[PDB]
Coordinates of C-alpha atoms and ligand atoms in Angstrom, one line a residue:
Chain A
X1 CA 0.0 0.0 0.0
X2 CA 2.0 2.6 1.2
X3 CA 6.8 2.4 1.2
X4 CA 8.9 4.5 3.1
X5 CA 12.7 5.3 2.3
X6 CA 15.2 7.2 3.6
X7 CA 17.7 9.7 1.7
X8 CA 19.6 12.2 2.6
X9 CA 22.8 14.4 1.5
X10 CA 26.5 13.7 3.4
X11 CA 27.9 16.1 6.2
X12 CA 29.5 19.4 5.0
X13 CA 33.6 19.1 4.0
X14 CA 36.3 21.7 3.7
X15 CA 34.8 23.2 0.5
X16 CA 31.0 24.3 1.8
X17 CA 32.3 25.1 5.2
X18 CA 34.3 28.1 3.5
X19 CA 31.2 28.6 1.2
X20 CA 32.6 27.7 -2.3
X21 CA 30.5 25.4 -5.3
X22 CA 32.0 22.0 -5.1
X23 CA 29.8 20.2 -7.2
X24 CA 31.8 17.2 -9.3
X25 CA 34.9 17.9 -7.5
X26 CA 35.5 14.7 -5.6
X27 CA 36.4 15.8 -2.4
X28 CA 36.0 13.7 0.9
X29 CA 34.3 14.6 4.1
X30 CA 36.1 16.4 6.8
X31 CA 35.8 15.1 10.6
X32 CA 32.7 16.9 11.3
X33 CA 31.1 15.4 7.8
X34 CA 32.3 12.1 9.5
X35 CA 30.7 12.6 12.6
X36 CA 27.5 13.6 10.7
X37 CA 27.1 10.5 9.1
X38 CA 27.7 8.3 12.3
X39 CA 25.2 10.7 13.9
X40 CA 22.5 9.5 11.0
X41 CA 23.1 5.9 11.5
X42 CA 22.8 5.8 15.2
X43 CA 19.3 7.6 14.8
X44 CA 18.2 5.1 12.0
X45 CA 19.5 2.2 14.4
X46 CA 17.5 3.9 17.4
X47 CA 14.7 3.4 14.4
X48 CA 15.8 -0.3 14.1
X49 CA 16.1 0.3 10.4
X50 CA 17.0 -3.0 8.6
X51 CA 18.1 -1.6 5.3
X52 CA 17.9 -4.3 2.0
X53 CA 19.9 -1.7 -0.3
X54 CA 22.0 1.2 -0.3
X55 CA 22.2 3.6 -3.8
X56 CA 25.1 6.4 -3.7
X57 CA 26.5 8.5 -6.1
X58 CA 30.0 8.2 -7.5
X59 CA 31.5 11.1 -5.6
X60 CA 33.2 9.4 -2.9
X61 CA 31.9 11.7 0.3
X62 CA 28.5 10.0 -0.5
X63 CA 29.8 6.6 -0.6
X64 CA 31.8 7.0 2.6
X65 CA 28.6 8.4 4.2
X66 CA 26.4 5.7 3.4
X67 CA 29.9 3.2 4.9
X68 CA 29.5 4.6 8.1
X69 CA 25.8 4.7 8.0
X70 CA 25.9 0.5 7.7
X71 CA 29.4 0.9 10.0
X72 CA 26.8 2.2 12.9
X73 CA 23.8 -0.4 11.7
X74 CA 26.4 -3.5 11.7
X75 CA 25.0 -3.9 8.1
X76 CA 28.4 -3.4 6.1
X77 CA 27.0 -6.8 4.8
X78 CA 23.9 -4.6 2.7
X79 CA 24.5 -4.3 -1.3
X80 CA 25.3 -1.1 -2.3
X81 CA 25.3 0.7 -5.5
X82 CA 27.0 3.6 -7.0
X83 CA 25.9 6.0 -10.1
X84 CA 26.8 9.0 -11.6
X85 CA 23.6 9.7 -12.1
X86 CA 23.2 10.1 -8.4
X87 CA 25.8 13.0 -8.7
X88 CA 25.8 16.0 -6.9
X89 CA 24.4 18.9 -9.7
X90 CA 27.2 20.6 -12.3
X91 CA 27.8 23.5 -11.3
X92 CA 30.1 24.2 -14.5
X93 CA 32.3 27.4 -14.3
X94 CA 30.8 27.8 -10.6
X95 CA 32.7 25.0 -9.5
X96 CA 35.3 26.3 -6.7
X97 CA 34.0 29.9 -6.7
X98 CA 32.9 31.4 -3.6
X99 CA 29.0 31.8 -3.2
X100 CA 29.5 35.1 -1.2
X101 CA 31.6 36.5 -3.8
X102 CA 29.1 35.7 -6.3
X103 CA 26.6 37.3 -4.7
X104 CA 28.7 40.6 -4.2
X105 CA 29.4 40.1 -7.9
X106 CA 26.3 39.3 -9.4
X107 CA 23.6 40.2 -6.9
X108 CA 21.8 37.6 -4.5
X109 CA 18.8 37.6 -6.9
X110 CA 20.8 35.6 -9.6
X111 CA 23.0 33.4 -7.5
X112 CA 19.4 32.6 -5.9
X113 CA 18.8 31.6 -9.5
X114 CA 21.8 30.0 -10.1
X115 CA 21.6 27.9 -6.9
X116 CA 17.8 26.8 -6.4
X117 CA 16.1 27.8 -10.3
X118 CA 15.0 24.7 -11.9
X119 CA 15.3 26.0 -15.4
X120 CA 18.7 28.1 -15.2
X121 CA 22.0 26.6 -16.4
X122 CA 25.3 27.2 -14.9
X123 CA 27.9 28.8 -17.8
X124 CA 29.5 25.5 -18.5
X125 CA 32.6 24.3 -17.5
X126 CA 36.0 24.6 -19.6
X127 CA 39.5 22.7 -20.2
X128 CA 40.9 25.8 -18.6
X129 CA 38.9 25.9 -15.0
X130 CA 41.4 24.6 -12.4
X131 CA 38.9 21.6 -11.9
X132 CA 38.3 20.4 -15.3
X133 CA 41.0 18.1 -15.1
X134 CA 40.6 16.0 -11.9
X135 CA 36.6 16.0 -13.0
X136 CA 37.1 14.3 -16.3
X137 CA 40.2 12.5 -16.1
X138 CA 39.3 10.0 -13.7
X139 CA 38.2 6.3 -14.7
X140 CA 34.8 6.5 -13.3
X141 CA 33.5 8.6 -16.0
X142 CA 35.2 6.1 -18.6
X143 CA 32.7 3.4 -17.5
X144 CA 29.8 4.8 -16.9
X145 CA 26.8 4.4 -19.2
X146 CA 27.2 7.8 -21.1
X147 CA 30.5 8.4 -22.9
X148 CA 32.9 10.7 -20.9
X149 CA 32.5 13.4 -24.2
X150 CA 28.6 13.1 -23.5
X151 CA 28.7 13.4 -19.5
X152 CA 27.6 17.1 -18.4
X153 CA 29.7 20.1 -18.0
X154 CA 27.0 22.1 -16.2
X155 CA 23.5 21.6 -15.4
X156 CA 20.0 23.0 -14.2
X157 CA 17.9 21.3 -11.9
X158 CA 16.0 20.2 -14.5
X159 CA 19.1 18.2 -16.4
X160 CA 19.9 17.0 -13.4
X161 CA 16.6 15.5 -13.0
X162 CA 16.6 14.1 -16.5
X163 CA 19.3 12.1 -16.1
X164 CA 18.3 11.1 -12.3
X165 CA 15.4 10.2 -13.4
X166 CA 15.7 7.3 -15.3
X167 CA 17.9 5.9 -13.0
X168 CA 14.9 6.3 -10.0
X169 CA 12.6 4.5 -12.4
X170 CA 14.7 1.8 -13.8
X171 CA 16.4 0.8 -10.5
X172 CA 15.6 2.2 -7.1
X173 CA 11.7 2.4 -7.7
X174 CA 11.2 -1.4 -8.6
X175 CA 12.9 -2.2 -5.4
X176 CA 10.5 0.3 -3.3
X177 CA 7.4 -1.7 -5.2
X178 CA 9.2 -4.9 -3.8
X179 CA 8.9 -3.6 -0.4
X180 CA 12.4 -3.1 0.2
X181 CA 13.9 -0.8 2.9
X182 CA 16.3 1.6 0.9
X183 CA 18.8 4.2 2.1
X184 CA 20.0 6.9 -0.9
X185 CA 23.2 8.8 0.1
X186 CA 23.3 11.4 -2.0
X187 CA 23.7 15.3 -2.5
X188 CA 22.2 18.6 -1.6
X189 CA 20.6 19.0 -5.5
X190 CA 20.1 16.0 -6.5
X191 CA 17.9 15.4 -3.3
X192 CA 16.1 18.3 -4.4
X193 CA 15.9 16.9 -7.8
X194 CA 14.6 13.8 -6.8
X195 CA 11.8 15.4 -4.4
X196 CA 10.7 18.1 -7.0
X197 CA 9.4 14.9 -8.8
X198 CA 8.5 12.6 -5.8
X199 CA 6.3 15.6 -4.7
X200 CA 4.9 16.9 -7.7
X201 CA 6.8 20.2 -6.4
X202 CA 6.3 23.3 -9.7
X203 CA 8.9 24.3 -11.4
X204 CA 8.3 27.7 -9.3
X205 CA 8.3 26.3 -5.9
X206 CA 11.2 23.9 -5.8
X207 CA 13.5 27.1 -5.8
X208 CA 12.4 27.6 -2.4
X209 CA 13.6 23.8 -0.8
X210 CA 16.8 24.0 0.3
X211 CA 18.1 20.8 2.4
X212 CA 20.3 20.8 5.3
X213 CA 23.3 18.7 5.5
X214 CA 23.5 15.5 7.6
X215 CA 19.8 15.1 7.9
X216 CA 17.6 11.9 7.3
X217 CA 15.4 12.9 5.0
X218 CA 11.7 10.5 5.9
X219 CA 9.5 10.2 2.4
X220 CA 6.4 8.0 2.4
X221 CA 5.8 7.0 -0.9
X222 CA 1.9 5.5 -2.0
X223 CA 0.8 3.2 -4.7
X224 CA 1.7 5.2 -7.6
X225 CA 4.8 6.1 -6.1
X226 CA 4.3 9.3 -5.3
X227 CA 4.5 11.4 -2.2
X228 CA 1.6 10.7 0.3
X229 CA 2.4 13.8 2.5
X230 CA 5.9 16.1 2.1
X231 CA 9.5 14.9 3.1
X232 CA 10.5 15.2 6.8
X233 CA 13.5 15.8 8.4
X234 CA 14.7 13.4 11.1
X235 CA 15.7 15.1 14.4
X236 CA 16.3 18.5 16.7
X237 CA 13.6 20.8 14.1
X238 CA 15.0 23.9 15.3
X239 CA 18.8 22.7 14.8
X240 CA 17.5 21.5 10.8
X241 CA 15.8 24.7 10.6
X242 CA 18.6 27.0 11.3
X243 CA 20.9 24.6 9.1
X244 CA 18.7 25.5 6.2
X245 CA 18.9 28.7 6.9
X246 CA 22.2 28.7 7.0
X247 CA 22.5 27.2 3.7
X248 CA 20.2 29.7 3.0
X249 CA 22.5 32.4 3.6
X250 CA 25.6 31.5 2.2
X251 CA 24.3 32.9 -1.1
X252 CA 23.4 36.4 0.6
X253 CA 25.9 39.2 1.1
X254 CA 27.2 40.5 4.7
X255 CA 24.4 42.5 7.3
Chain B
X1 CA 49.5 -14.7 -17.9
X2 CA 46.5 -14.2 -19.6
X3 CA 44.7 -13.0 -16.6
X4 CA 45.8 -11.7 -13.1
X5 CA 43.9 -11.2 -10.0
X6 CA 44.3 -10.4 -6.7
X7 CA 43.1 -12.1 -3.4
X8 CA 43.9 -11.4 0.3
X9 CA 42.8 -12.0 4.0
X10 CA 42.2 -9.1 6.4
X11 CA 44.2 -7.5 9.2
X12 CA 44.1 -8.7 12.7
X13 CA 41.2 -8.2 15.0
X14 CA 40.7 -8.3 19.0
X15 CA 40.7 -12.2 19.0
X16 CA 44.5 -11.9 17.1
X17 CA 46.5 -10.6 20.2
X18 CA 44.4 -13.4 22.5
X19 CA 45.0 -16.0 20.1
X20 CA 41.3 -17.5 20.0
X21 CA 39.2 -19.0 16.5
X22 CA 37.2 -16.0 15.5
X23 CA 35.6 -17.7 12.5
X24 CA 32.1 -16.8 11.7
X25 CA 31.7 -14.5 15.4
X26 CA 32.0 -11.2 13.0
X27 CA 34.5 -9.2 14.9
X28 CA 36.0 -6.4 13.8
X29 CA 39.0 -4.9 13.0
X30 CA 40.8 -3.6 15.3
X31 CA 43.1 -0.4 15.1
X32 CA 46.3 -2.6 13.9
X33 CA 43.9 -4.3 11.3
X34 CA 43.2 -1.9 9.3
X35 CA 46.4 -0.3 9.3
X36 CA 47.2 -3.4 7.6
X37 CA 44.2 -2.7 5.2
X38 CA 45.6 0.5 4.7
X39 CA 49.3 -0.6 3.7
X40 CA 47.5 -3.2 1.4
X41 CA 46.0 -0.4 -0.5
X42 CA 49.0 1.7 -1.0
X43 CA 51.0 -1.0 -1.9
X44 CA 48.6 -2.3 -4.7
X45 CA 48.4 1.7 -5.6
X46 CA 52.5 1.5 -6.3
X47 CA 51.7 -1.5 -8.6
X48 CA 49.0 0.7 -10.7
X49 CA 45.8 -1.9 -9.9
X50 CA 42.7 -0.9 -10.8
X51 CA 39.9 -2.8 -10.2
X52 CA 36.6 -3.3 -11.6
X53 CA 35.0 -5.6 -9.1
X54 CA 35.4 -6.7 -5.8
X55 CA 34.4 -9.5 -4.0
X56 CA 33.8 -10.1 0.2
X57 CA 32.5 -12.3 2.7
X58 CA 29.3 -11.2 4.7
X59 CA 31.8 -11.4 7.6
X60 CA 32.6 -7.1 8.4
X61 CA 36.3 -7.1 8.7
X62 CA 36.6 -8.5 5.5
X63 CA 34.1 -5.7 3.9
X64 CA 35.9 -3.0 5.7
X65 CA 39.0 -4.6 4.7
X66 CA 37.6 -4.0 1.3
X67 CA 36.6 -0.2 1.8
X68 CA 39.8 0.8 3.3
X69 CA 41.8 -0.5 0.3
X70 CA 39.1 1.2 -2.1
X71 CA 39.9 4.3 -0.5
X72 CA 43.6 4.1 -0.1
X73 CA 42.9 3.3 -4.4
X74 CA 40.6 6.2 -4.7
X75 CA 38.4 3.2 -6.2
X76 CA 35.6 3.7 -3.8
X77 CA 33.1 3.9 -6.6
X78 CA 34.2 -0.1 -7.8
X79 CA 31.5 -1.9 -7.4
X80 CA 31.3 -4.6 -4.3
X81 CA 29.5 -7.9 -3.8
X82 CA 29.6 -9.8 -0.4
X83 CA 28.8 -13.6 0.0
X84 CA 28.4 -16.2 3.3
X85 CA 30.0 -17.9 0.3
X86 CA 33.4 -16.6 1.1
X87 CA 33.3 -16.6 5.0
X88 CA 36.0 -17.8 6.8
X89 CA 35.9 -21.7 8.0
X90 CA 33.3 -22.8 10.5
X91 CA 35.4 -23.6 13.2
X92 CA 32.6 -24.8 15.0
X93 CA 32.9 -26.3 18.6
X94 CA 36.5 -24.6 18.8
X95 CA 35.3 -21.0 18.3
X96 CA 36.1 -18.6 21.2
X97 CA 38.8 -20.9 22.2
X98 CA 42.5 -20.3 22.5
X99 CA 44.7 -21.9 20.2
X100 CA 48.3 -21.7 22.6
X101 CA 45.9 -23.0 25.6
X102 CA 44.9 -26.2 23.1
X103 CA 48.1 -27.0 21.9
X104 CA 49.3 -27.0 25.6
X105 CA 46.5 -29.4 26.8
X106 CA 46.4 -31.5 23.3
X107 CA 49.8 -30.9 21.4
X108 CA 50.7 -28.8 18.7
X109 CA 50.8 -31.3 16.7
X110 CA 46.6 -32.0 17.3
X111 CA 46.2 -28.2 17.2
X112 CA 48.0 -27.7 13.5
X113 CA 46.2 -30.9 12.7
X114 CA 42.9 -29.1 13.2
X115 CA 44.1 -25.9 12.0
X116 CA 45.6 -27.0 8.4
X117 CA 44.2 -30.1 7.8
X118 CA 42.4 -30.5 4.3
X119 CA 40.0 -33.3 5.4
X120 CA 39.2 -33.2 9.3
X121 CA 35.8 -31.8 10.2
X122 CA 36.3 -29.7 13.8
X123 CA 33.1 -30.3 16.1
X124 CA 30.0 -28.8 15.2
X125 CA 29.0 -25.6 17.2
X126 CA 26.0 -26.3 19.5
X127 CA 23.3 -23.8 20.8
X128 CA 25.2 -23.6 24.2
X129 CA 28.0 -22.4 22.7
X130 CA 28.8 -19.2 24.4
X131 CA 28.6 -17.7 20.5
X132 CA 26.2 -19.6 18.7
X133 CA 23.5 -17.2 19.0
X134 CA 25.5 -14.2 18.1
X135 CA 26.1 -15.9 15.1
X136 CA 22.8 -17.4 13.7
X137 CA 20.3 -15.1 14.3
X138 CA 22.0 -12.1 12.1
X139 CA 19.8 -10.9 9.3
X140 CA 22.5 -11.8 7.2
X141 CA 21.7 -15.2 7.4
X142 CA 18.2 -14.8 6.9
X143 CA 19.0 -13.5 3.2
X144 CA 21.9 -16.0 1.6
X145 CA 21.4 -18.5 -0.9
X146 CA 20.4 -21.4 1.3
X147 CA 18.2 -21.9 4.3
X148 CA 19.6 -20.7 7.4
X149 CA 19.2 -24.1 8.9
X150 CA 21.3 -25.7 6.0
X151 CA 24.1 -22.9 7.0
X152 CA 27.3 -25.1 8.1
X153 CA 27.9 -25.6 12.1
X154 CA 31.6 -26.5 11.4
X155 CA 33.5 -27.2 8.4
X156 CA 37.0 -29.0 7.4
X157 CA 38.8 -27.0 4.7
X158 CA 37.3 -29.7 1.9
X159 CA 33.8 -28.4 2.9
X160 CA 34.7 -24.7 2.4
X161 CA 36.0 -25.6 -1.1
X162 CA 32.8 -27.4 -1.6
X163 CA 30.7 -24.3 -0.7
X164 CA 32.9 -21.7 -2.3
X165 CA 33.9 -23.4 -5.7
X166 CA 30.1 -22.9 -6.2
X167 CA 30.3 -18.9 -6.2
X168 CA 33.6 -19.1 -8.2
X169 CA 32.2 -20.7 -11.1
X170 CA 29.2 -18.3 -11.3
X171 CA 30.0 -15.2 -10.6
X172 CA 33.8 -14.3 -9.9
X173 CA 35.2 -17.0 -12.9
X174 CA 33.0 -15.2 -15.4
X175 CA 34.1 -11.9 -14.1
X176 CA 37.9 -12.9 -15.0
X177 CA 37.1 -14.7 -18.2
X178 CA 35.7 -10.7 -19.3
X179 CA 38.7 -9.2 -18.3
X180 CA 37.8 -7.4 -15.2
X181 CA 40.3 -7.2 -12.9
X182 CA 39.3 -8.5 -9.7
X183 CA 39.7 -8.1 -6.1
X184 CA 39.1 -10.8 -3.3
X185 CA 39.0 -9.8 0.0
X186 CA 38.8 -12.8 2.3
X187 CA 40.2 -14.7 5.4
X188 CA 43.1 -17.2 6.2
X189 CA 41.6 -20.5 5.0
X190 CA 38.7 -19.6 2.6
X191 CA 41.4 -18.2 0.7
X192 CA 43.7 -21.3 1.3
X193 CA 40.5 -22.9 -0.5
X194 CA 40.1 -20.9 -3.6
X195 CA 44.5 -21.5 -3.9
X196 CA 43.9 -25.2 -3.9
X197 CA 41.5 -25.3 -6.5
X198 CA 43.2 -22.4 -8.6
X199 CA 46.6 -23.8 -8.1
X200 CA 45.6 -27.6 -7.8
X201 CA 47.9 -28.0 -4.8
X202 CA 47.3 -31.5 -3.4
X203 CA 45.3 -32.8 -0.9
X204 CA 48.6 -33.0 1.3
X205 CA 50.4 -30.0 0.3
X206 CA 47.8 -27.7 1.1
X207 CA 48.2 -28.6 4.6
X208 CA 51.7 -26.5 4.8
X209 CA 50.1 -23.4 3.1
X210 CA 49.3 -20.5 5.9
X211 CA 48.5 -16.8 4.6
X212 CA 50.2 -13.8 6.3
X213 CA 47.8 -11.0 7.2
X214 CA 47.2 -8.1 5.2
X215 CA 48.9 -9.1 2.0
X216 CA 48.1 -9.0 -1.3
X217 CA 48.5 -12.5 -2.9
X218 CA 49.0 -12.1 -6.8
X219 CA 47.5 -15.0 -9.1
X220 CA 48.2 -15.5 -12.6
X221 CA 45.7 -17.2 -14.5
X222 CA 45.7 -18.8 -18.1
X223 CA 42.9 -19.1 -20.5
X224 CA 41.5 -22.1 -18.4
X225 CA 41.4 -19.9 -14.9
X226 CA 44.3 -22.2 -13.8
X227 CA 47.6 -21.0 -12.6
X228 CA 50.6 -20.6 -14.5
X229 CA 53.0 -20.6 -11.3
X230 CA 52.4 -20.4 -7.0
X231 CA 50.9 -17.5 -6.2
X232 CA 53.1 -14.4 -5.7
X233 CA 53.4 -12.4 -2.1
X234 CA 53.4 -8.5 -3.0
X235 CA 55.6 -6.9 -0.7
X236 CA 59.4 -7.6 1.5
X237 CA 59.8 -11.5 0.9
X238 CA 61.2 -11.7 4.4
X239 CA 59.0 -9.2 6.1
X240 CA 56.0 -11.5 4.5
X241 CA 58.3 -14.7 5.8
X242 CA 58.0 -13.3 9.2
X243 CA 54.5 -12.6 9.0
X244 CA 53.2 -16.3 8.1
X245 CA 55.7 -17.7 10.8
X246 CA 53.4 -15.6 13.5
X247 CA 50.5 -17.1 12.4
X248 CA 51.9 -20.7 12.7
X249 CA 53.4 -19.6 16.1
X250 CA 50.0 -19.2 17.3
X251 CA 49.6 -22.8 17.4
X252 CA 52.9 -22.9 19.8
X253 CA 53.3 -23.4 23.1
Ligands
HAI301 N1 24.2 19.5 9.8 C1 23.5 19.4 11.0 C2 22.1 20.0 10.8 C3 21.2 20.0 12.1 C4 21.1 18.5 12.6 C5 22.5 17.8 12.8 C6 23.3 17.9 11.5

């Protein structure tokens, strides 16, 4: 009748904590993102969750969440899975600038845009940005099931969620109709990405979801597989409120 | 060869410095285990591998075991699979028990009997074992490929072969047949199980085969899966010497 999963995006690293686009870059979780994870998997064990699968992205600070998640459940023995397609969103020439800055730069109105618009693309990323490199050059994108030429180099909400998409339908979602318990480590945007369609959120009022980091995100899902009632957040409200807002207002400029 | 892949078994855990069976209790690793893991992974780094799957027990240290290599690799996307399949032997009876004290009270010549012996069957663990509960009534269990009541309650290293050849044929041999190159992350003598087959040591040599902890084993395979020489230690010959005369000390008074 009715299936329940959990998802949720990995603690914040070096990269968000001094307010810049990371995006693609794989970098790994810091102590505190650590701790954050640990944090989630003692509250799903206080749940008694008995997960049956695990779905990541490629980016290792969500598969090293979703470890110590299982680490905290004793259930290192649960399949996991890892796709691109669970990737955090391209934030093209963005990558590695400073949201602040941006906002000083461009006004808050269109880093706003930039960061929560469904429909606005990032300017794309080039050979030349200090992060190309690392990005593409790394054998994970030489096996996915896209070419490395054909794999993004910036995208809107609404790419992100066409190539998320299929991925939801084709191999998480029969899984959920199976009854299975399921646990997606993921990112800030494609969480949102996800949920926009989960929801049945407009394309006007998914700019205003932001997610906080290190959160267990609770979606009941019915028959149809869609959203009986609107995600949840999994702990101290006040603390995941003032975490969004946070988030909220890394993309605003000072006083 | 035609094919290479790459097999190991774990880093020490609590039960290693107290010298007792560990076997299917699923203790973890402690701090000086996954060092081990972590020298594993650098070391296979120097050599350039880069795996497309990897392979595991249901057992955790050996699944950690796996994730601390992947990271050392910067291979934590490769894809992992985990089977009871692969779990260390059933030690049955003798679990929790310490090997030093047993070859004091019975001989070390009973104890390596028991230890490396190809055919004998240890006794079967019974519900009043102080860990037969811990062990049985893990979800893991629940979920494998046979009935949890048809799950071994001991095993001689012929019936680990017997229940591990199974998983090689269908889904790690294929694996290498494609080309992938593989990583098996195991214990001491499910791994001295897949050598025998792989290598077609005899039922009597096998007996003098111990694995050192932590250690990449290298194994070059021809068109047929079958070895084209022993398998290859990666790392200090006489560091790695050392390493498997510890584990036979164990079974010394
Ligand atoms: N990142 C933190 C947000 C508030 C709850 C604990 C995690």
């Amino acid at each position: 009748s009715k299936y329940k999963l959990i998802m949720l995006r990995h603690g914040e690293g070096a990269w968000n904590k001094e307010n810049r686009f990371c995006s693609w870059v794989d970098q790994k979780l810091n102590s505190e993102g650590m701790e954050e994870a640990r944090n989630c998997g003692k509250q799903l064990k206080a749940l008694n969750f008995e997960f049956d699968l695990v779905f990541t992205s490629v980016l290792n600070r969500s598969i090293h969440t979703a470890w110590l998640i299982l680490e905290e459940l004793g259930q290192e023995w649960v399949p996991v899975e890892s796709s691109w397609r669970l990737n955090e969103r391209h934030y093209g020439a963005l990558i590695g600038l400073n949201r602040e800055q941006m906002a000083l730069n461009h006004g808050e109105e269109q880093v706003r845009l930039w960061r929560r618009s469904y429909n606005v693309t990032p300017p794309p990323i080039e050979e030349s940005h200090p992060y190309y490199q690392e990005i593409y050059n790394d054998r994970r994108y030489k096996v996915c099931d896209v070419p490395l030429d054909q794999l993004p180099r910036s995208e809107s909400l609404k790419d992100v969620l066409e190539r998320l998409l299929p991925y939801w339908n084709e191999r998480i979602a029969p899984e959920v109709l199976r009854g299975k318990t399921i646990l997606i480590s993921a990112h800030g945007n494609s969480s949102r990405a996800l949920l926009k369609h989960l929801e049945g959120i407009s394309d006007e009022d998914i700019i205003n979801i932001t997610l906080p980091t290190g959160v267990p995100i609770l979606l009941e899902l019915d028959e149809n597989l869609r959203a009986v009632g609107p995600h949840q957040f999994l702990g101290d409200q006040e603390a995941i409120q003032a975490a969004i807002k946070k988030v909220e207002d890394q993309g605003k400029v000072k006083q």
